[PDB]
Design a protein around this nucleic acid. Sequence first.
RNA 1: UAUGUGAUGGAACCUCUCCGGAUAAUUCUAUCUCUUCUG
Length: 49
Amino acid sequence: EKSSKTSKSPVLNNVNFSNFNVLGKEKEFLNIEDVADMRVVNRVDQQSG
RNA sequence: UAUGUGAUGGAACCUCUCCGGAUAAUUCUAUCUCUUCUG
């Protein structure tokens, strides 16, 4: 397709991949802290623990 | 809610250090209570 030099918006896509959304929750807002949990996770030297 | 000839992020241990310890005989004698009416 050599789509170089063409940023493109309506130009042809022989194969295009759409976005993926959660089934059954297309219109459901909530908040970030209501579904997700936050941890830190660290890196250890393994020479001195 | 991406934009398309190129995503090892499974590509990273919240790890390391610190006596729930210290002191104490389950023992034993002095009152308690305020208004009485001329005495």
